[PDB]
Amino acid sequence: STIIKGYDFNEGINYDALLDQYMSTGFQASHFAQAVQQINTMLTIREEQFEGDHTLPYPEGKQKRACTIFLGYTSNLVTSGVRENIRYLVEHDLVDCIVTSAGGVEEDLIKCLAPSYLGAFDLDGKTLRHNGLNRAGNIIIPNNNYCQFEDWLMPILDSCELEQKNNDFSWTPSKLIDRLGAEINDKRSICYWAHRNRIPVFSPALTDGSIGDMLYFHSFRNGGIKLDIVEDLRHINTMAVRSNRTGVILLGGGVMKHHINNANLMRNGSDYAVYVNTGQEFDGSDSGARPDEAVSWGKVRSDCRPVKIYADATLVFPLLVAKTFARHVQQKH
Amino acid sequence: DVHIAEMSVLKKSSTMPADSTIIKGYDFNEGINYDALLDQYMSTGFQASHFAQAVQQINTMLTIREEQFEGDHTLPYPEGKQKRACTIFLGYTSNLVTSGVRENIRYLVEHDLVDCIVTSAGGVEEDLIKCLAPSYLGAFDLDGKTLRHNGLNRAGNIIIPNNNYCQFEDWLMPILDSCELEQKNNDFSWTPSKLIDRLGAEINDKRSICYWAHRNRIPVFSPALTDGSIGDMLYFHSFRNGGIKLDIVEDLRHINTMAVRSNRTGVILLGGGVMKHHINNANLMRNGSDYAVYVNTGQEFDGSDSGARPDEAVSWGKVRSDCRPVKIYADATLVFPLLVAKTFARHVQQKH
Amino acid sequence: NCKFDVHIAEMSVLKKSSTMPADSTIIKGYDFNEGINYDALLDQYMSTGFQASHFAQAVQQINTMLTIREEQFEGDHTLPYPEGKQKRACTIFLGYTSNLVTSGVRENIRYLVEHDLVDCIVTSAGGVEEDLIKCLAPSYLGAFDLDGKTLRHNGLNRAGNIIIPNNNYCQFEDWLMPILDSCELEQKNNDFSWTPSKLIDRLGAEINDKRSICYWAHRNRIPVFSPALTDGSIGDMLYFHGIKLDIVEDLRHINTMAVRSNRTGVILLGGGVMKHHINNANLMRNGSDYAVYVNTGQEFDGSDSGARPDEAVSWGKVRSDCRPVKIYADATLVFPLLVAKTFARHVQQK
Amino acid sequence: EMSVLKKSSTMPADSTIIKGYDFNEGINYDALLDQYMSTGFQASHFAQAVQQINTMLTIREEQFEGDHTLPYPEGKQKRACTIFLGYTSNLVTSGVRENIRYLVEHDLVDCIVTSAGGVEEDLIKCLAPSYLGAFDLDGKTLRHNGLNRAGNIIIPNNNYCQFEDWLMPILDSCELEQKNNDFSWTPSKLIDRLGAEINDKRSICYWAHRNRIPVFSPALTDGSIGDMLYFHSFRNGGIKLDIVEDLRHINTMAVRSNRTGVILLGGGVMKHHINNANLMRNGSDYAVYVNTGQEFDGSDSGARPDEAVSWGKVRSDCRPVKIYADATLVFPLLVAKTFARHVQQK
Ligand SMILES: NC(=O)c1ccc[n+]([C@@H]2O[C@H](COP(=O)([O-])OP(=O)(O)OC[C@H]3O[C@@H](n4cnc5c(N)ncnc54)[C@H](O)[C@@H]3O)[C@@H](O)[C@H]2O)c1
Ligand SMILES: NC(=O)c1ccc[n+]([C@@H]2O[C@H](COP(=O)([O-])OP(=O)(O)OC[C@H]3O[C@@H](n4cnc5c(N)ncnc54)[C@H](O)[C@@H]3O)[C@@H](O)[C@H]2O)c1
Ligand SMILES: NC(=O)c1ccc[n+]([C@@H]2O[C@H](COP(=O)([O-])OP(=O)(O)OC[C@H]3O[C@@H](n4cnc5c(N)ncnc54)[C@H](O)[C@@H]3O)[C@@H](O)[C@H]2O)c1
Ligand SMILES: [Cl-]
């Protein structure tokens, strides 16, 4: 049994030791330390040799690893500075699959055109609207950002519609997001690195946002394009079924959390699971449900020892990356 | 010491406006009158005041919706759908269909009190599956490994036995075979709303929200229809002969155009997630909704769209500045049945 | 290949399920096609699930307390504090936070105390003050988003979406100072030892207003315990004003009340000292027999406020045989409806 | 297109661009945490809280006008800024105890308000340890084994039995000193005594007593100490704890302060008591909240700092920061960036 004792600053300011001793601190600090162990286990197994097919069918030529890591995050996380932390993960090819919402895709792309700014939660809606300043928490995203996005996007959508009509090509969210990653051609973009490293980005509700607004506007031109979500479901589910092992790292809740968990039901559950969300169990929401709820469904395995950290991900994810993904890249070099 | 302290704590205060509401709860010495009790939630404060404000907002929507208005009295989708003076968008999450609030939503749809529904895959499937088999009251603290061994799925303190889903598969596969045939032969493009209309027609059960939505030409939009048991069925089904394509772009055109062509719009959002953003985003197209009630447990501090206040939506133009949006911070199972008692149900009773 | 993918997946997703017990409750909400019947609607909260089910379980627990409380029992039918207090078969401890008294809930608590349906109260300094201050002047409905600097310049104090004008406190000072002069005199001349409960009994007698919880608590010999009574306006007045408030005597009084009880029920609206103090008193008798918690706190931060009732069972503050119930909700939304289905129904039945 | 493509005003030239820390630059924790300011949401609040506490600490070291001594404790010395630190009992049950102890040990805070549990668990940890358990452990099973649960932490019941053995003799002396010397006990006086008696450099209460930092607890009877006080009163009547004298001490400390700063971990009486003391001097100058409380229920616990401004408990010119978080996650890191950096600098 582990004795409760925090870090003693009489020993000096050692961040690595401080965060190790989160294990003996208790409450969510202990969950932080358990989450570091779970992710380091995923990253370790992922570098091991394994039996069978070393290729995955989607995308074409995607290599398989001992452990398939599914990374899920909400749109607000991309809107915040956590985007740089997620980009680092995808850039260094440390995750195999992404699930995010329309917001998670567009804000990442829009940031390559124009920045977002620190505001406050208590700014008045009518005053902000008069000035075309959109509020996401304490973050300002000027509406000119979206105007620039429209200018950038329509020519790409014209090409996509042409490829649909001429080549009988069936667009899915993941195929479209792969394309927008290739087009943005920016080493600061998560979507760019996902395209480069053949990490598919699935977004069943991709119409729910600016990309939606543009697709809607684009349709008047010549009828528009079609986005099939059934094919994309085949892709994510098959990836899980064909995996040697799976880990899930879910930041936030909503569709992203359920989709990744559902895909892992197809293989009778994930082997490793970290949740980093602020949701609560009392309302009966999937968002606030505990990892042990997912075990009842068979979406997380019984031998797995899932960890959930109840915290804002902007506070804890950058520190998780410091202790896991970043340490792993530093060790390899 | 005492003189400095008195200056800070003894400060004189301005006169309050003459219209100001006095805080006074319901006095049970007057007897048990539920209508009076819930009216006096207005002078109770905190969320109780928000409950009373929400009753007023929904009753305003329902009142305006009965009125005459100028212009086109038809909406393009579904075909031949009549337009009212206010278009009411009802949004709910999957767990609210897994709860008994399903019966409250069904009553609204059956009585043609709302014009448009947005819900998730769960919100559709659970409603259909409840016509085949029941869900049961369990507890939140039931062990996952033990429940899994027994094929008992847990959703909060509710048990959905996995045989319910096996039955769903038996029921759904033949319908998907017909849908695929209609896609191949008639060059028909399926969307979530078109598929949910079809499943409503097939279930043919007066206990189903989806049945009444079909019957009353109330479209159900679900952009992420593949996220659930329906997706699982869709997955398995694709191996039989290739499968069905579900286009989300056409369904976006339908909901956005419904908003753009509305005389007025009200939004009633139970929960957060895609449902909330999708309805709010459709109303951006007309420069915001005229009336808005949120009933969710989300918090602002994490910056999530889910936990955001209605005034955030005003900044984007998804809710009008004129609008006086109300959020109740509560579990919908506690407050929504009582909202229906004071709003929708009162309206049907008054009419009949 | 394709065939193996779909057949592996079907095995995981199509698992057969065990039979549910025959007494299992089917999830079914209230059907408004049956008409608007609030009593039936709230009964069927039991089969609605999530917190609605907890509401229905809480109604049953409180109705059990009120039922047992009317029964005959064995032994001493008197409690030592206050002097000449009648013991019932169940002692009900009511706890509530200051904000609840700030809200319209106060009228619901006053009704309970007025009709002598609870035996003991624990609240904070605010819970005592606001109730007294509402006899002198009213509180108004404002909004959560009102600016602090603007409100301060106007002497308007904000408590959630409720406004308490600072003149209310000035009036309180005028009213309280003469009472504190008398109390101090009684301390000096009669060697009297003041406790929070003794002082709150006195302020109840002085306010002499049938709208006041504290007035009815005094009248019905329902003790009000407030260990941190210095934490507020009463504190401010005691600061400006030579009286000693002993909290050790008051602790003996609440603990002995628990130890000498035939049965105990706890009804806790909120969290904080109120919750910990009532739960601690019941540890002395190896736990309460019935317990309803109505609060918004969460477990994850390890707070006493957010702890679930099962955690208390670990301490022995709540009994193993008890079936405690917690509703995760704002009390202003649920407490008046609990009173409609429990305390009010009970008074109507008699 | 008219509604969705509306043109936007230019942002001020000083506006902060949202950019998180790039791990391509390597693992630098000081740079990472500086970059929380541009990160957004709570991360931004973390960075603003570091600035507020560093302002308090920096100001505290400077010279100021007037009396340089405080009345309570008698030998207490006043500083340019008086820092009031508040914490709930669960943070003392956690390893954050070691972080609080470091603050008090290095005389970096002047006043302390906590609950009975915040005092008890600090002393009991010098007698026997607490262990890491889980939130989901069954109450009946734990009770059968005499294991008390606080969140995911186990406090074996023998810990409290040892406490009782340690505390009763001390209480006997306190009662003797009340009867013979006509001494009036307050919570702060009793907690000072317990700190002296524990005589253990791991204890917050030990360092508080040694550095003349007072610990106020208006509801010091609410817990194991109260239980001991209850049993002990049956011998010869027991001790008397006056809360009015202790109110005079904390209020006067604030009223005589050149400047005041508040650091509140959690809510409850601790938060209101410190805020109320500062109301006497027309509010605190600097304020950091770390709690998980929400505004919606109207509780004082979940109230934003701007509510406290309406009452005059926090000043208008102050720029209060709340971090919405479990303090076990953020407080150790706040100490790394503020209090520890300060001790390292001097
Ligand atoms: N405003 C925007 O940024 C924006 C932009 C365009 C589209 N959208 C759309 O809005 C919809 C709703 O967003 P969503 O579904 O991605 O998420 P959401 O807002 O529904 O959040 C899901 C849940 O995740 C948790 N969570 C969120 N942020 C967290 C954080 N920082 N730390 C910890 N937990 C956190 C919360 O419990 C929350 O309820 C999406 O469909 C998206 O496409 C949003
Ligand atoms: N657990 C299930 O019931 C279940 C089963 C099948 C499908 N799904 C899928 O899970 C995904 C995510 O679920 P979702 O988006 O429908 O909801 P969700 O669980 O993500 O809830 C989103 C937010 O709604 C609010 N909320 C939830 N329940 C509430 C209540 N009772 N009262 C008030 N507010 C409440 C909360 O703020 C919560 O963060 C969906 O794509 C859905 O199809 C879930
Ligand atoms: N701002 C005020 O209203 C005010 C005024 C004067 C005195 N005070 C003092 O503030 C201190 C703190 O207040 P407290 O200890 O009474 O409670 P609190 O404000 O600390 O509330 C504690 C917990 O109770 C729960 N809760 C509160 N209100 C609720 C509600 N309406 N519904 C459901 N759950 C609810 C929440 O989980 C909260 O975290 C006390 O010492 C009190 O005397 C407050
Ligand atoms: Cl095509």
Numbering used by the authors:
A (entry chain B): 29 to 361
B (entry chain C): 10 to 361
C (entry chain A): 6 to 246, 252 to 360
D (entry chain D): 15 to 360
Which statements did the authors publish about this structure?
DHS catalyzes the NAD+-dependent transfer of the 4-aminobutyl moiety from the polyamine spermidine to a specific lysine residue in eukaryotic translation factor 5A (eIF5A). In eukaryotic cells, mature eIF5A is required for translation elongation and termination, and essential for cell viability. Most eukaryotic DHS proteins are functional homotetrameric enzymes.
We thus determined the crystal structure of full-length, recombinant BmDHS (residues 1–366) bound to cofactor NAD+ to a resolution of 2.3 Å. The interface area for protomers contributing residues to the same active site was quite extensive and totaled ~2,500 Å2. NAD+ molecules occupied three out of the four active sites of the tetramer (see below). Thus, one of the active sites formed by protomers B1 and B2 was open to the solvent. Within BmDHS active site, the NAD+ molecule was oriented in such a manner that its adenine ring was accommodated by protein residues at the bottom of the funnel, whereas the cofactor nicotinamide ring pointed towards the active site entrance (approximately 15 Å to Phe244 phenyl ring).
